[PDB]
Amino acid sequence: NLFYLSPPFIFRKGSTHITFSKETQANRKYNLPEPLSYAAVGGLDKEIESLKSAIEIPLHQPTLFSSFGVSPPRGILLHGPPGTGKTMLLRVVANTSNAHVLTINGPSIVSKYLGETEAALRDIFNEARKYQPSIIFIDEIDSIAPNRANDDSGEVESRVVATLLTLMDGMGAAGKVVVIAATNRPNSVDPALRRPGRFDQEVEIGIPDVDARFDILTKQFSRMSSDRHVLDSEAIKYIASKTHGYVGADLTALCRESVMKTIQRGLGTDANIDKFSLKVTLKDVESAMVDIRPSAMREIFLEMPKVYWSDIGGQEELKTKMKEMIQLPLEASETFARLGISAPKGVLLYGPPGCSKTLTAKALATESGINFLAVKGPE
Amino acid sequence: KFKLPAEFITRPHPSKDHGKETCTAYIHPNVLSSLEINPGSFCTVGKIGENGILVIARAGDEEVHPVNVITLSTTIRSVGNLILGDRLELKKAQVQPPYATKVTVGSLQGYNILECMEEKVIQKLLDDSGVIMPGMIFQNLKTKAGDESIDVVITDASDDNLFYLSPPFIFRKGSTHITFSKETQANRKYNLPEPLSYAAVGGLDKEIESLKSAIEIPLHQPTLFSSFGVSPPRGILLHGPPGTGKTMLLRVVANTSNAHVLTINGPSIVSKYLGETEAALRDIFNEARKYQPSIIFIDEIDSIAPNRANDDSGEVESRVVATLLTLMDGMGAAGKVVVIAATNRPNSVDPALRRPGRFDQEVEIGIPDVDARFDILTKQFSRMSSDRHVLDSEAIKYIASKTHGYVGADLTALCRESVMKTIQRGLGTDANIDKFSLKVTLKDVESAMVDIRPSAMREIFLEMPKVYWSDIGGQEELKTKMKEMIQLPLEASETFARLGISAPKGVLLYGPPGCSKTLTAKALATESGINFLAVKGPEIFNKYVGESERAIREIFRKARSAAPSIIFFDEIDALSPDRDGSSTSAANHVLTSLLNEIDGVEELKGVVIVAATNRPDEIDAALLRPGRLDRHIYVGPPDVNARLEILKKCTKKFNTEESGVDLHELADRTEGYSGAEVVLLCQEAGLAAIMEDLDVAKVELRHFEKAFKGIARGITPEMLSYYEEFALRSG
Amino acid sequence: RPNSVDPALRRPGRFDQEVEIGIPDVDARFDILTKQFSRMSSDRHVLDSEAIKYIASKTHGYVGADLTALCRESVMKTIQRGLGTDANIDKFSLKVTLKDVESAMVDIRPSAMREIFLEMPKVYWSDIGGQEELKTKMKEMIQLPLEASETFARLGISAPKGVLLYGPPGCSKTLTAKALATESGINFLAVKGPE
Numbered sequence A: 001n002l003f004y005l006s007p008p009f010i011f012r013k014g015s016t017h018i019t020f021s022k023e024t025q026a027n028r029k030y031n032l033p034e035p036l037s038y039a040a041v042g043g044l045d046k047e048i049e050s051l052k053s054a055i056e057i058p059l060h061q062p063t064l065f066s067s068f069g070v071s072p073p074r075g076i077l078l079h080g081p082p083g084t085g086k087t088m089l090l091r092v093v094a095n096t097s098n099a100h101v102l103t104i105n106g107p108s109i110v111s112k113y114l115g116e117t118e119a120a121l122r123d124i125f126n127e128a129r130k131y132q133p134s135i136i137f138i139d140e141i142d143s144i145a146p147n148r149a150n151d152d153s154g155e156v157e158s159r160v161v162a163t164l165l166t167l168m169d170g171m172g173a174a175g176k177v178v179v180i181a182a183t184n185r186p187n188s189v190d191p192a193l194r195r196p197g198r199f200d201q202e203v204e205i206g207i208p209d210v211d212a213r214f215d216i217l218t219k220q221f222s223r224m225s226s227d228r229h230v231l232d233s234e235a236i237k238y239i240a241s242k243t244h245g246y247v248g249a250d251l252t253a254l255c256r257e258s259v260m261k262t263i264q265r266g267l268g269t270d271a272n273i274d275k276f277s278l279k280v281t282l283k284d285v286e287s288a289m290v291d292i293r294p295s296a297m298r299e300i301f302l303e304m305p306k307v308y309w310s311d312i313g314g315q316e317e318l319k320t321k322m323k324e325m326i327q328l329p330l331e332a333s334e335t336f337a338r339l340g341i342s343a344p345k346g347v348l349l350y351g352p353p354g355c356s357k358t359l360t361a362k363a364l365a366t367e368s369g370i371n372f373l374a375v376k377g378p379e
Numbered sequence B: 001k002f003k004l005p006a007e008f009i010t011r012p013h014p015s016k017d018h019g020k021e022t023c024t025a026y027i028h029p030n031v032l033s034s035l036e037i038n039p040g041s042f043c044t045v046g047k048i049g050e051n052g053i054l055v056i057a058r059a060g061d062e063e064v065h066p067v068n069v070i071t072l073s074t075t076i077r078s079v080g081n082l083i084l085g086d087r088l089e090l091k092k093a094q095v096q097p098p099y100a101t102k103v104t105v106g107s108l109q110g111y112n113i114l115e116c117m118e119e120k121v122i123q124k125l126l127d128d129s130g131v132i133m134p135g136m137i138f139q140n141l142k143t144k145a146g147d148e149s150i151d152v153v154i155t156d157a158s159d160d161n162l163f164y165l166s167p168p169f170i171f172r173k174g175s176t177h178i179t180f181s182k183e184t185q186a187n188r189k190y191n192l193p194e195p196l197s198y199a200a201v202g203g204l205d206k207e208i209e210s211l212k213s214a215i216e217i218p219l220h221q222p223t224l225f226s227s228f229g230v231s232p233p234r235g236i237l238l239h240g241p242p243g244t245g246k247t248m249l250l251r252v253v254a255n256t257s258n259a260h261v262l263t264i265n266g267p268s269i270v271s272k273y274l275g276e277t278e279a280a281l282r283d284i285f286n287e288a289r290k291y292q293p294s295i296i297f298i299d300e301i302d303s304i305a306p307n308r309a310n311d312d313s314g315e316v317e318s319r320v321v322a323t324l325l326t327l328m329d330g331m332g333a334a335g336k337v338v339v340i341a342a343t344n345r346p347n348s349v350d351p352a353l354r355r356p357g358r359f360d361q362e363v364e365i366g367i368p369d370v371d372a373r374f375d376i377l378t379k380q381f382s383r384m385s386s387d388r389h390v391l392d393s394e395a396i397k398y399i400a401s402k403t404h405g406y407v408g409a410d411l412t413a414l415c416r417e418s419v420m421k422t423i424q425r426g427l428g429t430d431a432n433i434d435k436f437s438l439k440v441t442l443k444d445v446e447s448a449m450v451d452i453r454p455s456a457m458r459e460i461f462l463e464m465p466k467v468y469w470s471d472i473g474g475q476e477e478l479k480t481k482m483k484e485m486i487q488l489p490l491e492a493s494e495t496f497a498r499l500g501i502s503a504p505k506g507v508l509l510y511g512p513p514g515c516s517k518t519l520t521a522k523a524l525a526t527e528s529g530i531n532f533l534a535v536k537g538p539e540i541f542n543k544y545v546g547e548s549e550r551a552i553r554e555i556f557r558k559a560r561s562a563a564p565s566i567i568f569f570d571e572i573d574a575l576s577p578d579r580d581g582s583s584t585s586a587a588n589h590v591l592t593s594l595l596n597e598i599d600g601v602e603e604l605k606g607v608v609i610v611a612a613t614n615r616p617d618e619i620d621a622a623l624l625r626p627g628r629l630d631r632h633i634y635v636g637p638p639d640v641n642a643r644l645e646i647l648k649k650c651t652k653k654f655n656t657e658e659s660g661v662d663l664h665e666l667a668d669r670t671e672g673y674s675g676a677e678v679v680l681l682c683q684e685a686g687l688a689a690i691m692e693d694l695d696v697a698k699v700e701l702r703h704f705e706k707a708f709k710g711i712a713r714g715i716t717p718e719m720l721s722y723y724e725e726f727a728l729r730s731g
Numbered sequence C: 001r002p003n004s005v006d007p008a009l010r011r012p013g014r015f016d017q018e019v020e021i022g023i024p025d026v027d028a029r030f031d032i033l034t035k036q037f038s039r040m041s042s043d044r045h046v047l048d049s050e051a052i053k054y055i056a057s058k059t060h061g062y063v064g065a066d067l068t069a070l071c072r073e074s075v076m077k078t079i080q081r082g083l084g085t086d087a088n089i090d091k092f093s094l095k096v097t098l099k100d101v102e103s104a105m106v107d108i109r110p111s112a113m114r115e116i117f118l119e120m121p122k123v124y125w126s127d128i129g130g131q132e133e134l135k136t137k138m139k140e141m142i143q144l145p146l147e148a149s150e151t152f153a154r155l156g157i158s159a160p161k162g163v164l165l166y167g168p169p170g171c172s173k174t175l176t177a178k179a180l181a182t183e184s185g186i187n188f189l190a191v192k193g194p195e
């Protein structure tokens, strides 16, 4: 009657047929945990190889540095805006590397009794020393190791930061141990904790480029079945160029919302329709994208009633020049790049009240595709 | 019933210089019996959490040995680098280790000891051990000359990795063979712990003499003070910026000083119960007093002893501080105990601890200068010693000259990153090269400098392009004057020291919009070599009463740390009203902080201040004085040659050499243009060419004429008259 | 911290009498130094008893433990002087010359003065060309009231304890502050404006 993660069976030669297959993974029926791998991470290629180097040499080839008379780099810190995939990197590092894996999940170690938070850290680092090689993860380091000089950091923060400092570089030794940390606020981490010897490397993990977003979208859509209908490159490339300022969590939300839109369309067609054949068509992605907001833009509220160029009566000169400024440098990038010329990046629209000044700004906002931040004089 | 302790304490053999004892661990017979380790059997000893050494048990006098103490000679203690007072885990050996054929007798003083010594006694000294391993040292063996002594090392043994730190071997006499060498260290593939020594510390000669004076006499020569009737000292407080060598000095003192060593690593003693933190301190000090001479180390003493008047310091903190005070200087005497504490924040340690009898000396471990840095780099590159090709002492001196602001940890990181550049170079030529066979050339140190910023500069995120002095057209006088300040003081330092004069520390760049001011800031940030800080005008201001001044003080602090350094004050007039009666209190206090921090009661040594302004007559006189903003340099609209250089640089990727346009005619045409207007002319011309077609070939004179017709001259004779009548003062 | 103790304990019948062990003045300093130099009594040579009054007169801010540190560092300085003259001179045979106490005073700053971290390179009254009236008036306040204390007590006057230095930028106002820090002898604190 017991409950198992996988059914137990016994092999009895001859009487149990060893039937071959080509499926490279276990049967999907079972909900077996499936290893996360680097192939699921998009972009960040150079950062991924930097993580590989700084994880591999300290743990799996230390005698190379001992041969060269230098200490090993026992620290990596990942910083960059939220949603860029910092915890994804920590989980893939955990699941890929063969090492003792320990985690300080910020507030998970914290206690209201005087010395217990510090004792949790000492036990974690002594376990890492005991079993080698070892990787210690600290997601949101800034939650347990604040600046220690600012006003709100009292004695408790001082003692926790001191424990981290002394367990990384103090009278005690390290061993084949590497500490990997992630933070959205690198400068809120204590300044004496980022010196070489502690978090020597600061592998920045920033917002994706157009190439990075294309990579993330191809890898996200590779997870699905043959119900995509988005041409592996072209449609995904259009979606990647149309996403500006996206970070990667929002792109996953966009894919999930596209699935939601396709299946709600299916329900609106008929309740008993054969959904699985309802390919997510690019218009479903479009309907999804209008219902998501870029990570860097949730707080940019706009009423923006979707102005288009044809609404502006005349002003053909202004329209041509604003096409020059906003559209062309992206639609003809290689030409400007090869001429060594950066397009003009500022314009002043001046004229009597009630002309097309603000309306042209709104038209740029809702025709250029790029983001659009607005300001007013006395606000 | 007898209770078995969980942790034993190392202590020294009192008995003898040498003998068969050299592998015997005397233990309390209660413990020996309880563990069934009868005398003569094989037992293992090791630091907690680590593999163990193999030794021979013996029983100690019941009335002298406490239960905790295990007694070991220097020979065995050298193997695992066991410092007296280290906590041991003792265990019985399940299996007798095998026999080796090779005994690799090394030397520490490096002589041909077989000539300096009679090997017929060396054989006895090697034989007596019974067990043999890599690492065992033998000490103070008198030479044939008698007046001198030698030390010996067993570097390795083998026969022709888990549960054992050093591979244990048994001395099967006759099958064992000597393989003598001058080598001083064990095979690094074993990965034994390498003892620390003072020779690994550089740039702290005076501080090292101070610590040695304040440790040796109080511990190993107390009768000297008693003869004079002065009480011995009890403390040293090492302090200084993070990364300067404090904990390294504590580790070296622990390794080299022949005293019982106890440690308090930050709040390692802080406990949830009401009186356990005080009990821990009292236990530590009673142990120190029981096993004199002893040293009690306290890292992060600002974390177990705050100021006790600070708001956050409650009763727990008060009780701990009181315990320290009473244990160091109270009604009971502490004996021959020296407390060496390291702290990055000396003023957070309670004032009562910082007075004679508690912390007599406070030794500052400061940021290394050029020579201290040369020492550090020499010592590390000597720790390399074959894989370098960085040699002749000039390349390391060059690196010391180039790595400004480095603190000592950054230098270790530089060596490591240079090694990694070597590894990836080797991969760059052979994807399977032998990484143990490479060498780290000066190219690699230079290639690592570009990825290591000083720890002082970590907070200063300035994402700037790469602007060269070749980008700035004209401004030759400005370039010469800026070189005189930025690079000459560092290249011609000896000449300045000889003439007795230091270079001026400030320049005010003033001129009309669009002429080279901030561009020179970027050029310095790229070409200067010395560290660059920048404040973008009113960036510092804050609604609160005392924060806008703290921003100034903090930026100047960060510049002091990273000296030599450049601070660029962009549009400084935002910070410096004229004090003619304006009621803007925050601006006036910012101005006063800036004044008193450029040239005030404390001098500003290595920082050079650059400030750019559009409206230079609005700046205060006290700021423009010599000593703060020494020399005023006018950056005006480019002349014909400067325009022409701008055009040649900007129009390079226009295939102008084909036909149509002629840059000299243009340079003459654009009189009165700011440089930005010339750049705009080129940009708009390229844009018009793109409009006539998406070619990549060439622009035409039609495009330049069209662009010229659009750009208006933003600089007027009133502006130039203003700037020239300001300049008229200099004469 | 007398006020940190509960008032109920600071009541007659529980803590009847409170005794204030204050900071020693010149006479207390001299008594302390006489007794700490009496325990030495033969390795000393400082015994003129005018040398000890001299030292006491220059030990500004010394609280009583600083004087012990002073004697100890004097022993160390004479030790290292002996080693400098001869490589293996018997350290037990040396004597503590007055020069040794003077050379120790350059290292021991009072415990009350240990929170004040001021860099302040050396500057001397000879570096400040001119300003002779200023130098005379600064001496009249910083040194005469300590050199001529008994005369002031006889005439019944206290010297003025404030001076406002004013003038155009670039003259020796802050330079005089650095000169005072280097050459006044007495302790130096500084507040840098809106700090």
Ligand SMILES: Nc1ncnc2c1ncn2[C@@H]1O[C@H](COP(=O)(O)OP(=O)(O)OP(O)(O)=S)[C@@H](O)[C@H]1O
Binding pocket: A040, A041, A042, A043, A081, A082, A083, A084, A085, A086, A087, A088, A139, A140, A182, A216, A247, A248, A249, A252
């Ligand atoms: N290539 C990718 N880059 C980034 N995020 C991805 C990527 N692929 C999937 N994701 C999803 O985006 C999220 C990335 O993890 P997050 O933890 O949200 O990132 P993070 O916010 O930087 O880490 P935190 O703040 O410590 S939770 C997860 O929900 C992933 O499922």
Ligand SMILES: Nc1ncnc2c1ncn2[C@@H]1O[C@H](COP(=O)(O)OP(=O)(O)OP(O)(O)=S)[C@@H](O)[C@H]1O
Binding pocket: A311, A312, A313, A314, A315, A352, A353, A354, A355, A356, A357, A358, A359, A360
């Ligand atoms: N070609 C046009 N010229 C002027 N107004 C136009 C034009 N086309 C449409 N409009 C309308 O006229 C009004 C002008 O509004 P705005 O574009 O805000 O003018 P405005 O000059 O920006 O006014 P301000 O900013 O308050 S001075 C809006 O209702 C527009 O929809």
Ligand SMILES: Nc1ncnc2c1ncn2[C@@H]1O[C@H](COP(=O)(O)OP(=O)(O)OP(O)(O)=S)[C@@H](O)[C@H]1O
Binding pocket: A165, A166, A169, A170, A192, A196, A197, B200, B201, B202, B203, B241, B242, B243, B244, B245, B246, B247, B248, B249, B299, B300, B342, B343, B344, B376, B379, B407, B408, B409, B412
């Ligand atoms: N010759 C040297 N001189 C000084 N420092 C050195 C030298 N060689 C290496 N170092 C580095 O200096 C550092 C010594 O650490 P410390 O500066 O004492 O630590 P800290 O950040 O100041 O605070 P704590 O409490 O002492 S860990 C280590 O990172 C060493 O690698």
Ligand SMILES: Nc1ncnc2c1ncn2[C@@H]1O[C@H](COP(=O)(O)OP(=O)(O)OP(O)(O)=S)[C@@H](O)[C@H]1O
Binding pocket: B471, B472, B473, B474, B511, B512, B513, B514, B515, B516, B517, B518, B519, B520, B612, B613, B614, B638, B646, B674, B675, B676, B679
């Ligand atoms: N030789 C040159 N001289 C001046 N400006 C140049 C030159 N070459 C390029 N520029 C352009 O000049 C622009 C303005 O740079 P700066 O001269 O630093 O402006 P500025 O002098 O600081 O004027 P203010 O005081 O900020 S309004 C840059 O964006 C460059 O593109």
Ligand SMILES: Nc1ncnc2c1ncn2[C@@H]1O[C@H](COP(=O)(O)OP(=O)(O)OP(O)(O)=S)[C@@H](O)[C@H]1O
Binding pocket: B599, B600, B622, B625, B627, C127, C128, C129, C130, C168, C169, C170, C171, C172, C173, C174, C175, C176
């Ligand atoms: N005899 C002297 N008189 C005046 N200044 C001198 C003299 N000798 C050298 N100086 C220089 O003059 C500078 C003036 O320094 P400060 O005392 O800071 O001036 P200041 O009186 O404080 O003016 P302000 O109000 O601070 S701008 C010193 O830093 C020296 O470099």
